[PDB]
């Protein structure tokens, strides 16, 4: 009778959860969000149904992910703790929002997810549920005392026992998340921050060492801070559709060893965690975007935006995408992107993304009025305050 919409990935955790909820008497709808992971969605839907789902939704969210999520983060050049481009964090609110909309469509009273009881993704799901429809009841088995006792090999044994299909070959020994923006790799041997990742940790980018010994020049065009065109100046390739252009940046980046990050981050739930991230396309876009801002944005606007950029990234990381405070910052950050319009040429070569030229119709260089006397005054007035401080303390 009772319906639950379960965020279903096809992996062992959500497959066990799906069976388990069916066994508890729920009508389970499996919701499969395609945000660019290189998964077999046909197989995943079959697995859900064989596991007991009444109905499967396979939702192609890739274009929306790009235009309304990745490009929104781009407004702040969002980087968490100086470094992390937030690939998992940017996807989760989109995935949860769509889950909310499906539950409303189905008249389901419950949403469920299989995020772990001790990570960040659980927060990103649940804060979104709360922000969009607080009337939906939330099921999180990894925080359920009963589930937690049963599954402290317990998951595989239960799959075998209950007729849940299981993977026909060994899983990679890392916890990995993948979407159109990045692949993350955590846990296993990576848990020790003094352990150097071996090359097999990486699955998208080639290493800078293996990347071709030849430069590629791209021109990336923006309008009010949004990418609108990528042109390969070597081979002539041109992309204008936002999804295709972003995918093309991923391709160029990955081929050329761009976008690897190895860091220890502070979690929202927990203390610290070591992650290895591969972000080929967004790495390129963020660098190009900042370069155009250099020639277009007012100095004082940039300074204030940069002051607030850590907060913007924190809100994304923590799961407050759909929060009043995010709306406050976005109002200003969007205003700052007005007339961030023009084109940047980037040289791409063995891991390096180097702006070499840029142009904007909205700059002084579209083909000042002071003198040395003005400088003298400007200095003298600023200096006054410093003299006073000295003549006292």
């Amino acid at each position: 009778k009772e319906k639950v919409v379960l965020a279903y990935s096809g992996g062992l955790d959500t497959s066990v959860i799906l069976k388990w909820l069916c066994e508890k008497g729920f009508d389970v709808i499996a919701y499969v969000a395609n945000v660019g992971q290189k998964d077999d969605f046909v197989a995943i839907k079959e697995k859900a149904l064989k596991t007991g789902a009444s109905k499967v939704y396979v939702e192609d969210l890739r274009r929306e992910f790009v235009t309304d999520y990745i490009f929104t983060a781009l407004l702040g050049n969002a980087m968490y703790e100086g470094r992390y481009l937030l690939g998992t964090a940017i996807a989760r609110p989109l995935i949860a929002k769509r889950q909310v909309e499906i539950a409303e469509k189905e008249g389901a009273q419950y949403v469920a997810h299989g995020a772990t009881g001790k990570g960040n993704d659980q927060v990103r799901f649940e804060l979104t549920y709360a922000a969009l429809n607080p009337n939906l009841k939330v099921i999180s088995p990894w925080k359920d005392p009963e589930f937690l006792a049963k599954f402290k090999t317990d998951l595989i044994n239960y799959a075998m026992e209950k007729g849940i299909p299981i993977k026909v070959s060994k899983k990679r020994p890392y916890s990995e998340d993948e979407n159109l923006m990045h692949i993350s790799h955590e846990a296993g041997k990576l848990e020790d921050p003094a352990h150097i990742p071996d090359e097999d940790v990486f699955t998208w980018t080639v290493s800078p060492k293996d990347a071709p010994d030849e430069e590629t020049l791209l021109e990336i065009h923006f309008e009010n801070g949004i990418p609108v065109k990528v042109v390969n100046l070597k081979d002539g390739t041109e992309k204008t559709d936002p999804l295709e252009l972003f995918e093309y940046l991923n391709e160029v980046g990955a081929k050329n060893g761009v976008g690897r990050l190895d860091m220890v981050e502070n979690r929202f739930i927990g203390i610290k965690s070591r992650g290895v991230y591969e972000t080929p396309g967004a790495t390129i876009l963020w660098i190009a975007h900042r370069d155009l801002e250099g020639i277009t944005m007012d100095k004082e606007v940039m300074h204030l935006r940069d002051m607030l950029a850590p907060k913007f990234a924190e809100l994304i990381y923590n799961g407050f995408w759909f929060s009043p405070e995010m709306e406050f910052l976005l109002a200003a950050f969007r205003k700052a992107q007005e007339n961030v319009t023009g084109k940047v040429t980037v040289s791409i070569y063995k891991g390096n993304v180097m702006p070499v030229a840029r142009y904007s119709p909205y700059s002084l260089y579209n083909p000042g009025g002071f003198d040395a006397t003005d400088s003298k005054g400007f200095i003298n007035i600023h200096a006054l305050r410093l003299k006073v401080h000295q003549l006292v303390k």
Copy 2:
């Protein structure tokens, strides 16, 4: 009778100014600051004396530049407008401060400088003078109406040098010190002009750099670099000046540290610059990586929020200001126990942290039930916003 301490580079501008002040009857002390530029300081001393200087100070300020200036910027991972590592801005307060101290030593009543009338460096000189000894009178010929009347162009400077018997390459304006070389103006002034490889003079291009990675272990204590070890060839540096120069060599040989950007000026509006900062690029990246494993999250968030302001103060010339003192109090506090070592892979322009260790981390206490409460309290506020709006 009246003494002036002139910041003397040996170039045309300051040699002219030396003579000019001497002609006005000042006793000029020439102050020559060695901050790592490639100059013949012996020659410059001799020229100063021959031009009129009663005395010459040649000050080797390299070690102080590293320990008290570059390592101070490092406290905030200082980067102006996202990108710029401030090589010109970090040196100038040091040079100006030593100038003030000499004037105090000599009982000189004036300090003078030859920076230009529409750039940033004049501000960095004069704000340091003001902050450290407001009693000193400041001479700035390039903002002096009489000087500007007389020296309308380079030919005027050159002719005067010939008349007065003053002794005596690239189409870019360039500043060089231990931390960086900058290249601006000329063809670079157009931000749509791609710099020729010939613009770069310190770092090899990534394209020409060795096809084998270098691995360095960089050790820090309270945010201060204390050791560099080359993991493949065994080189170890512990002296701060030697370790910094070694980072410069490893970066330059491997194509690290190039930046091409347009920055907002303090005096003026926007300028396109090309900068080569090999060693500090490495250091800043290594430092941020160690902070990842050592710093409290909330400290880091606040520090990062304030880091643009910290960089702005450095850029604008407010090194010796009350507001810089305020920020440094906090930023130094944040660096307590930023202690450990980082392994970085250096390869054709890339500087990649691959491993790190600190004795002051939990790599040297809750359950899932707790997460449920943490989430629910946080979510409350969001549910209200929805129910009401």
Copy 3:
């Protein structure tokens, strides 16, 4: 003929400038901005013509001042250096903007002002001119070496020679600026910050000592952070028009001794200055508005807004009203005011403005979501990080 639009106040400085610009061969348009000063604008316009002006614009800007300037500052509860409600600073950009618009209507090539060469108002004028129309040339006689040399008693002597009328009685011995929002008093004896102002410094508010020993209760209603009604709960007066409502708050405040401030502020041009300010109506509105925000605004939004509110006030003080950075902040600050809608009851008594009640349809109080187990988890997760800091500061510190 060269046409200049001069910001003309009718006082000694601008009358001399008017004359002088006539004597230098300009066609001068005198622009007189009525922003609520209690001046005889008929006499000012005549003085302008007697002094040589070709034409006079007397512009009633009071309503616009309230709705587009005072109410804009209110969005941030703007207070400069914790205290100053910015009455002079909020008026100058409106005055300068209208001046630019009159120069453009008239095809004047120049705008001019008489603000002093060493104060803040000059900046507020000239940054507005630059922001709105950089093609206009700016005349500032108090920064003009010639004008400056002549007028180091020298102004009064020149007025006499040129037939310029001068004031028929002694001026109050303070520098005073007045508009609908405040009266300011500086200089003279107030220059010494250890000098206690005597009661004759004050010219709008009664002192709290002199105010009636009787409370007044007002209800102030807001919609999206904008005042939309004032009701006197004792005597029934009601006002909804923004100008009338603001004037009424001025009246109630002044009668009840509200809005006096004595402080030393840091100038933008210069160092420090001691000022005495009387801001009766806005003092009330600012207090009421913050009280309503208590029941309506999200906590994290309020926190961010309050972090940025010093910058917002700085921008107003310094003259950057029409700057890109102000537009950036205002986008966020306006967003924070959505649904700041409701009513606040304030008790007004001998200088005190005390919120006693408030209501909003957009709040949880418009006529259970966690338990002690939730608290435990929330505390435990927050405590984790602190436990690590302790087991780090405890040990040997190298």
Copy 4:
């Protein structure tokens, strides 16, 4: 065998908790903090022993409350959400710190408190325990499922007290210490309910206060109050406790320090409170006035930008956190040479600075030509912006 140091108030909840812990077999040490509340501490100590505590510590923390907590908040003119002077929040870390110190002294392995399970004080206790000694085990009966099952309501507490021989007014929840008294809940819970004058118990109303102003001169050194002088009656205090109590007396007599607001909670959402903070209201106003003549503009601007965060840390219970240490380093630096005296007029609720003086000011060098350059350089950037907003906007 195992020792617990319980923060003991003498009220019903902590008396029940003392007995309950004793019955579970703990050796309970009762810690009684005197932070200025008007309690009979002699009676409380006797009750604790009567109820089963093995030892009682009655700690007079009033002077330390002033010098190390109230004066620390003063460094940032701390005001939460524009208005709240943090009376409850400032006292709790002190109380908790001394509790940890007693536990350390007694070799106790547990600390306990009786703060409620859905309030803010429990956080202030427990974050302080975590920050100062994470080895201590924490007992919080109001978040313990067993205690909560047993004591579903006040009647259960009362019956247990009777049953176990535990010895033993206003329709508001009230917190009282040297800095303030707070009043919440009951009828005040409705923010549209105007508080009756009877809600107020410390300060007289402005309406009832004397119709004559009092003039005080308050002297500071490096942001710390060092002297108060009454200019009309000659009273003078320099000791920090005496001076603060004197400000409380003058404020309360003259109707100063009342606040009625809705604040956002840390645990929970919004709450309406009425607060009476006579002395500190005076001190905060005086302090800000002195800063006007002493502090550098840019320091003041940065400090004020950070002041909301400073107040948040205090409210939330992060007094002993690394991020607080970070801010304190800077905020203390800002107070160097905040030294001088301020004269305030106090009259029927008003605290008005009327004069001030510092030896560290120009009250103890540019020209008009300079203004022209300063303005022109600043204007450049605005002229560029205009020549780009006037364009076709794509």
